[PDB]
Each structure stands twice: as structure tokens, then as C-alpha cells.
Amino acid sequence: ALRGTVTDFSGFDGRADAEVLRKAMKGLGTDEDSILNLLTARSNAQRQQIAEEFKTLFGRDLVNDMKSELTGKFEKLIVALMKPSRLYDAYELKHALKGAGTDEKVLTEIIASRTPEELRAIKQAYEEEYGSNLEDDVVGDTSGYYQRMLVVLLQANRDPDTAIDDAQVELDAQALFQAGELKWGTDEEKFITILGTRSVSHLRRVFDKYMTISGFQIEETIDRETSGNLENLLLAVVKSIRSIPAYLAETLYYAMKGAGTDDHTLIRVIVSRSEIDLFNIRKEFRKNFATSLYSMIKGDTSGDYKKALLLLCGGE
Numbered sequence: 211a212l213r214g215t216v217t218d219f220s221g222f223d224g225r226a227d228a229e230v231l232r233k234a235m236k237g238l239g240t241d242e243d244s245i246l247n248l249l250t251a252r253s254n255a256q257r258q259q260i261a262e263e264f265k266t267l268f269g270r271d272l273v274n275d276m277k278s279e280l281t282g283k284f285e286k287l288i289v290a291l292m293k294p295s296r297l298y299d300a301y302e303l304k305h306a307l308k309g310a311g312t313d314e315k316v317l318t319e320i321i322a323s324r325t326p327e328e329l330r331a332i333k334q335a336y337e338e339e340y341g342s343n344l345e346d347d348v349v350g351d352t353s354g355y356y357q358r359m360l361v362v363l364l365q366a367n368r369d370p371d372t373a374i375d376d377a378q379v380e381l382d383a384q385a386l387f388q389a390g391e392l393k394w395g396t397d398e399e400k401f402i403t404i405l406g407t408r409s410v411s412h413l414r415r416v417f418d419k420y421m422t423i424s425g426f427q428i429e430e431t432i433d434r435e436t437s438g439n440l441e442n443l444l445l446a447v448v449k450s451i452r453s454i455p456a457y458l459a460e461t462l463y464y465a466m467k468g469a470g471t472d473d474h475t476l477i478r479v480i481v482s483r484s485e486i487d488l489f490n491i492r493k494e495f496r497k498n499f500a501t502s503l504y505s506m507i508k509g510d511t512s513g514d515y516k517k518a519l520l521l522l523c524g525g526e
């Protein structure tokens with residue numbers, strides 16, 4: 211089913227690539243284009259082996275040398291590209307959570323779209339890297355039913371997908387209907403429990419059944435019932451339940467639609483998904499916005515940043 215756009219380079223020689231990169235950085239100036247070109251064509255695992263070889267040949271740290279060399283967006287992109295896969299989401303969440311700053315955009319995006327298996331992996335990689343517990347960090351920086359919905363999701367405890375029980379499907383669509391539209395106010399506790407714990411395939415049936423009973427798609431009710439971060443988060447969760455690729459594709463579209471470019475989100479989703487499902491994300495993107503992702507990136511960005519980004523997307 212899923213497909214990323216970056217694979218392992220056949221005929222990889224770690225040590226040959228470290229020499230290319232030394233040479234691209236040695237002395238006056240920088241050859242961005244050999245870096246760019248070499249690195250968007252190696253898998254993340256291969257980038258780690260290259261970083262190892264560079265260190266045993268030159269006693270130098272590859273990423274440190276690269277960030278003295280490079281600047282701006284392209285620096286940020288090559289650095290994200292060099293982050294170990296198993297550490298990148300942990301890193302982005304730690305960086306969303308920190309200082310005064312908490313950036314709900316990133317927290318909502320990662321935690322709503324990662325599977326239980328990935329949230330487990332992420333929670334383990336965060337405490338082992340940052341010496342703080344992820345849940346405790348989120349709680350500390352968030353409030354309300356937004357906070358609670360993130361903790362539910364952080365339990366990575368969604369029900370398995372067994373066979374569908376149609377009475378349960380009816381029972382949950384009716385409960386959501388009584389919790390929001392038939393309610394003066396909203397029973398957010400009900401929404402967080404059903405949306406937060408039920409298996410994915412059962413929620414796909416609930417959403418349709420909800421449509422049938424109410425005449426509304428669940429998104430429309432979420433929008434009528436809730437405001438702010440919690441609205442944002444429940445929308446993100448619902449979208450991810452129907453399709454993580456499609457959700458991420460519209461995260462992308464909106465980063466670079468809104469006049470400027472949310473370079474942070476562009477780098478973050480392209481790099482995070484490049485070996486998971488970025489192919490399928492480009493599919494959902496062509497389907498819904500009637501542009502190729504390539505064409506939209508090619509026009510919203512520039513330089514070596516644009517070149518690297520397009521080599522990572524691929525497409526026609």
C-alpha cells in the first residue's frame with residue numbers, strides 16, 4: 211500500500227560518499243549541488259553510515275560542518291534530512307514544546323497522524339534523548355480538552371481492527387449525535403473517548419452512519435460544536451482516520467497556499483514521510499487540489515532548497 215519516494219541506494223559505498231562530501235566542503239566556498247544531490251538520493255539509514263564514515267576518515271562531524279557551510283532554509287532541510295528517522299518526530303515535538311513556546315500546529319499534526327506503533331516508538335526515542343517524559347511535557351504546556359485529547363492519543367491505545375459490529379457502529383454514531391448536535395453545549399468527553407480509542411475501521415463506519423442519521427459529516431459537526439485547538443485537533447484526528455496521506459497532503463497544500471510558505475511544515479512533512487508514504491501523499495495531493503505537489507513546490511520555493519525539495523518529492 212504505502213510508499214515513500216526515497217529508497218536505499220544500490221551500490222552504496224559509505225566511504226566514497228564521505229569523500230565527496232569532504233571535497234564539496236573543503237576550502238573556500240561550498241558546492242551545495244553535490245551535497246544536495248548526494249543526500250536526496252541516499253536513504254536516512256545510508257546518511258547515518260555516511261556520517262559515520264566521515265567521522266572515521268576525517269575526525270570531523272558531518273552535520274556540524276554542514277551547518278557552518280550552509281545557511282537558511284536549505285541548511286534546515288539538510289539538517290532535518292540528516293536527523294535519524296526514529297528521532298526526527300521526537301525532535302520536532304521537543305522543539306514545538308519548548309521554551310515558553312508551545313506550537314500546537316506541530317503537536318496536533320504529529321500526534322493526530324502517527325499510528326499507535328509510531329507514538330510508542332516516538333515516546334521511547336524522546337525520553338531516551340531528552341531526559342524528560344513526552345506526556346509530562348505536553349500536559350505541562352497544554353490545557354483543557356485539547357490537552358486531554360493529546361494524552362488519550364499519547365497512550366497509543368486505540369482499539370484493534372477486528373470485525374465490525376454494526377450495533378456498536380449505531381451506538382457510537384447516535385452517542386456523537388446526542389453529545390453534540392442534540393446537546394445544548396457539547397459533551398467533549400464523549401467525542402475524545404470515541405474518537406480517541408475506537409479502532410480505525412470502526413470509526414470509518416461510524417462517520418458514514420453519523421452522516422446517515424444526522425445529515426452532517428462529522429467534520430461539520432466538529433466545526434459547529436467546538437472552537438480553537440480542540441476543533442483543530444479533532445479535525446486532524448478525523449482526517450487521519452479516513453486517510454493519513456490525504457490529511458498530510460492537505461497540511462502541505464495549506465502550508466504553501468497561504469501567501470508565504472510555511473517552510474517549517476514543508477520541510478517537516480516532506481522529510482518525515484519520504485520513506486513512509488510520500489508517494490501516496492503526492493497521489494492524494496493530485497486528486498484533491500488538481501496540481502502535482504512538485505509543481506506547487508517548484509513555484510513556492512527557490513534555490514538549492516527548491517532543488518533538493520523537488521528531488522525528494524519526485525513526480526512529473
Ligand SMILES: [Ca+2]
Pocket residue numbers: 234235236237238239240279
Ligand atoms: Ca567550505
Ligand SMILES: [Ca+2]
Pocket residue numbers: 277278279280281282285
Ligand atoms: Ca549556517
Ligand SMILES: [Ca+2]
Pocket residue numbers: 307308309310311312351
Ligand atoms: Ca513550552
Ligand SMILES: [Ca+2]
Pocket residue numbers: 349350351352353357
Ligand atoms: Ca497543563
Ligand SMILES: [Ca+2]
Pocket residue numbers: 389390391392393394395396435
Ligand atoms: Ca451542541
Ligand SMILES: [Ca+2]
Pocket residue numbers: 432433434435436437438441
Ligand atoms: Ca468551530
Ligand SMILES: [Ca+2]
Pocket residue numbers: 465466467468469470471510
Ligand atoms: Ca505560497
